[PDB]
Amino acid sequence: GSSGSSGPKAPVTGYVRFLNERREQIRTRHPDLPFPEITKMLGAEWSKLQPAEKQRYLDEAEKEKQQYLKELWAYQQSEAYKVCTESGPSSG
């Protein structure tokens, strides 16, 4: 399999991060509930979350983010980025 395309794979925010893992929990229980049927349920939880989990989740999406960030510019601005099987601009 191949991952990553047209730049770094934008990581899920802190609000979605929790929904990502949870999404599975539901699927197991309601294997019939579609996409726009499972998320609608989790959402409610996010609001009924604790002052320790909700806050953390948001933080967990901070450290990781950085990684992606650098994978957006640190890459775009690199010899490998310019150097390619193309033709045209050649030192004038």
UniProtKB/Swiss-Prot annotation:
Tissue distribution: Widely expressed in adult tissues, particularly kidney, skin, testis and uterus. Highly expressed in embryonic tissues with high mitotic index, such as the proliferating ventricular zones of the fore-, mid- and hindbrain.
Cellular compartment(s): Nucleus; Chromosome
Domain of life: Eukaryota
DNA-binding region boundaries: 8-76
Annotated function: Required for correct progression through G2 phase of the cell cycle and entry into mitosis. Required for RCOR1/CoREST mediated repression of neuronal specific gene promoters.
Oligomeric and partner information: Component of a BHC histone deacetylase complex that contains HDAC1, HDAC2, HMG20B/BRAF35, KDM1A, RCOR1/CoREST and PHF21A/BHC80. The BHC complex may also contain ZMYM2, ZNF217, ZMYM3, GSE1 and GTF2I. Interacts with the BRCA2 tumor suppressor protein. Interacts with DTNB.
Name used for this protein in its record: SWI/SNF-related matrix-associated actin-dependent regulator of chromatin subfamily E member 1-related
Organism: Mus musculus
Stretch of the intact protein here: 70 to 148 of 317
